[PDB]
Write a protein that binds this ligand. Structure first.
Ligand SMILES: Nc1ncnc2c1ncn2[C@@H]1O[C@H](COP(=O)(O)OP(=O)(O)OP(O)(O)=S)[C@@H](O)[C@H]1O
Ligand SMILES: Nc1ncnc2c1ncn2[C@@H]1O[C@H](COP(=O)(O)OP(=O)(O)OP(O)(O)=S)[C@@H](O)[C@H]1O
Ligand SMILES: Nc1ncnc2c1ncn2[C@@H]1O[C@H](COP(=O)(O)OP(=O)(O)OP(O)(O)=S)[C@@H](O)[C@H]1O
Ligand SMILES: [Mg+2]
Lengths: 351, 223, 236, 119
């Protein structure tokens, strides 16, 4: 009834919603993502089972007004009680809720990425009523928008395509959500969203544009917490190692791997190099092991725990030089016969 | 604290009802630095009480008649403008409240150390140096162009800062940092005014490699 | 109804399920384990309470279409909304589910692996307005989809998790366009035929050589502990 | 009902159960322990309170079929649910099961010496 209370005027408000109410930059990504979120909300109202695994995340200052803007859009159906993603109670809390706010991403701290994906991407809520006799099977009519104050809130890098961060700034806000997001204005926003959705009512219409998706990937990486080990591993792997390197003891292996030459002095020919008998003296690395990284690159002597090599293996896989399958080979006196990668520096030395 | 509605189902209830929050919160503390957030604490309003400066005693003088009079006065003031905006503090009160909240909050001592480290001029060939050479040059104490008792342009202002560069050069640590160390260094860098807020990938050196870092602008410092 | 909606003509689709759709290897282990998985699914449908503790696990990139292929196979009765595997209410989440998929985005904790072992090991569920209504069937068949290459930690979990390595650019048929309800129905009819040739749980087990080289695969997908090699070098 | 469903013909297959099905050596210790284990199983299903502190641990390769032999022995009453000896959850998973299998002795890794000895 609210959506159809008034016909849309034609003012095109939803695209610049967070742009001029919260100060988000006037990118194509922001416009597309806010438009798609509004259409997704209207779709979940009109098609209660429609698929939608996206969610907006609003980053900004303490006083910018993110929660107030979400509350105005939610109105009576706004939800502020999703503090966890586990248990059967939250699905009951999503009954009369349409716009749901993961305030401060509090649930994120408690939950795991799999739980977040399962909660966001669900379609139905299977639970019996308090006094009913039969399970009710309510479709999921709620759409999720989270607000945060921490810049680097996406700690994981495996599943992050769902979250679309938006960077707000109070100084950039032309309007104010406190007195300008009147119920008539949100009604006119949702009317426009309904018009756009009706232009093509399908679950694929809620996906982002190709250019919008291309910026979305970059923004998700910019808001994702990075691993600084992979850069160090890559720099260590890019060092030419002398020929007959695996036949040296560990003590001289460390000094050979820690004699660093500038990349201008390589004087390469694709594979051969004269670092200034010289052409064959040094050669690119052919293999690397997690234990070799532990003992040679980090100059460690204590026996490493399992999680250290788990982290080193993750870093080596994230490295663009190493593959993904591990082969068993002898590495040296301190490393022994180990499962290691086959580093191929083809991406490197193409300079 | 900021929540306005609680959605939940009563003990003997039919549905998960929405309950508007009719309660108002006050806290009493004995610790001084009780605010543990460095980003901001606008909602909290620390009031520093002190006995021997109390002209009246809450044990004897706060009779229910007196509190009823206080709440009647509050109702009068609110009814002068029955709006949420009326509840907001005065423009001067807000400016003083910002200072009070930062006074009663916990501080990140790493931020000052980071800022001091970034203020040291570095050699023009700083990035084309060994890690030990970087530790030697950066750790010395040192008229946009500088003359630290040398030729002009031998020392310049820093333009890139990495969390691993902080970990390896500023702290001079050969230990491999846990992710919680670099997260703290990243927060310290973001709270720095010289440092920006968006990280861009660039290659730093032999011990650091190609890693995401900040472009640092010392325009505030040398001016 | 769907499995018996149409009989099975001779096309031999059961063996090359994940080979030509997810770019797996044309290996005897892959064919045998995919065939046995489809037979286990149709057996759990037909002989509800049966002993089938195996679990296909698919490894691949972020977009090889393993979750899409699993959803295409499951249809309406595909399930992914299972994230915790210990407790009592979990058995309620299995009511309308046939093919349950466990997706591992980030690395599972050591407890979660034991939880999924003890969950897929069950063959019966108990729920409830009288007579305790023991939901004996347990028609569910489980498939996991993992992002990390090395997902096996304990030696206990081996011999029950059957990993399959899925690659891209080598998949003959696109799972987004070629797994249609007709083809999956024909595959399940073929599985029905093969399982009805020997309706027993022993028919759901792998071939002897298939199992012995499944041991090799499970070793190739497990953590290495990296210390036996160093001790060997010290001893040498 | 199953135990006395059919009388016992004098075949003498109790003392060599693990000997000729799992390949254990033909020691006197092996025969005695497996015979006493089966006698204890029958006792505990007949005299529920009987005191039987023993439990047989089958050590062997990963293909000898220890779990298979145990499951065949147990029948519909075989249990592999137990994973730890801490709390009342183990007692609640130990009620409807005649034979309980400590898979890979995982519980032994997750519990103290005193806890496993008491349980
Ligand atoms: N009626 C109002 N008119 C103007 N400003 C208001 C009003 N109500 C609250 N504010 C201010 O708006 C800010 C709080 O708005 P919120 O929606 O809580 O912002 P937020 O950025 O979501 O906050 P957090 O702390 O990050 S959840 C504070 O500066 C308040 O003083
Ligand atoms: N026509 C298409 N339809 C659907 N997805 C497509 C299509 N073309 C490419 N894709 C991509 O294929 C992937 C589909 O994979 P999913 O089934 O959603 O999850 P997945 O393949 O299992 O990967 P993970 O590691 O489990 S998230 C997504 O990354 C899509 O972007
Ligand atoms: N028909 C068969 N004949 C011989 N061996 C078989 C046959 N079917 C399966 N196996 C093997 O028997 C083993 C089955 O494992 P289980 O039944 O748990 O017994 P197990 O050998 O003790 O294994 P674990 O890991 O120690 S519990 C596997 O090694 C199979 O390869
Ligand atoms: Mg807020």
């Amino acid at each position: 009834s609210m959506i159809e209370s008034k016909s849309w005027d034609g003012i095109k408000r939803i695209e610049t919603l967070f742009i001029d109410y919260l100060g988000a930059e006037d990118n194509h990504y922001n416009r597309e993502v806010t438009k798609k979120w509004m259409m997704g909300a209207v779709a979940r109202i009109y098609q209660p089972g429609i698929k939608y695994d996206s969610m907006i995340i609003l980053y900004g200052g303490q006083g910018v007004g993110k929660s107030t803007a979400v509350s105005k859009l939610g109105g009576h159906w706004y939800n502020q009680s999703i503090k966890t993603f586990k248990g059967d109670e939250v699905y009951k809390k999503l009954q009369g809720s349409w716009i749901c706010e993961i305030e401060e991403l509090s649930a994120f701290q408690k939950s795991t990425i799999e739980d977040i994906k399962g909660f966001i991407s669900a379609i139905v809520d299977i639970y019996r009523a308090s006094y009913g006799k039969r399970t009710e099977r309510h479709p999921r009519q709620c759409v999720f928008v989270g607000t945060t104050n921490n810049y680097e809130f996406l700690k994981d890098q495996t599943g992050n395509r769902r979250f679309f961060p938006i960077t707000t700034d109070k100084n950039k806000a032309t309007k104010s959500p406190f007195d300008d997001l009147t119920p008539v204005v949100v009604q006119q926003m949702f009317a426009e969203a309904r018009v756009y959705f009706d232009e093509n009512p399908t679950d694929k219409a809620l996906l982002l544009d190709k250019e919008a998706s291309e910026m979305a990937l970059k923004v998700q990486e910019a808001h994702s917490e990075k691993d600084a080990l992979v850069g160090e591993i890559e720099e260590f792997l890019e060092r030419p190692i002398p020929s007959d390197y695996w036949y040296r003891t560990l003590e001289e292996k460390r000094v050979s791997a820690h004699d660093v030459i500038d990349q201008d002095y390589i004087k390469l020919y694709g594979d051969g190099k004269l670092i200034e008998a010289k052409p064959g003296a040094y050669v690119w690395r052919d293999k690397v092991c997690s234990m070799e990284i532990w003992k040679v690159m980090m100059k460690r002597d204590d026996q490493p725990q399992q999680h250290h090599l788990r982290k080193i293996d993750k870093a080596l896989r994230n490295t663009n030089y190493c593959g993904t399958v591990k082969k068993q080979t002898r590495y040296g006196e301190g490393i022994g016969k180990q499962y290691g990668f086959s580093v191929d520096l083809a991406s490197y030395y193409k300079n | 604290i900021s929540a306005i509605v609680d959605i939940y189902r009563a003990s003997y209830g039919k549905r998960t009802e929405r309950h508007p929050r009719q309660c108002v919160f006050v806290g009493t503390t004995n610790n001084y630095e009780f605010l543990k957030d460095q980003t901001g604490n606008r909602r909290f309003f620390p009031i520093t009480t002190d006995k021997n400066k109390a002209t009246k005693s809450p044990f004897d003088d706060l009779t229910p008649v007196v509190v009823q009079q206080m709440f009647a006065e509050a109702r009068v003031y609110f009814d002068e403008n029955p709006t949420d905006k009326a509840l907001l503090l005065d423009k001067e009160a807000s400016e003083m409240a910002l200072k009070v909240q930062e006074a009663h909050s916990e501080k990140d001592a790493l931020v000052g150390e980071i800022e001091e480290f970034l203020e040291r001029p570095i050699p023009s060939d700083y990035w084309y140096r060994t890690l030990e050479e970087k530790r030697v040059s950066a750790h010395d104490v040192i008229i946009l162009i500088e003359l630290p008792n040398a030729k002009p342009g031998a020392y310049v202002w820093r333009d890139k800062v990495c969390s691993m560069e902080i970990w390896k050069v500023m702290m001079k640590r050969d230990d491999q940092p846990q992710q919680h160390h670099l997260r703290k260094i990243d927060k310290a860098l973001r709270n720095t005014n010289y440092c920006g807020t968006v990280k861009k990938q660039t290659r730093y050196g032999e011990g650091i490699g190609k890693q995401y870092g900040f472009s640092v602008d010392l325009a505030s410092y040398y001016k």
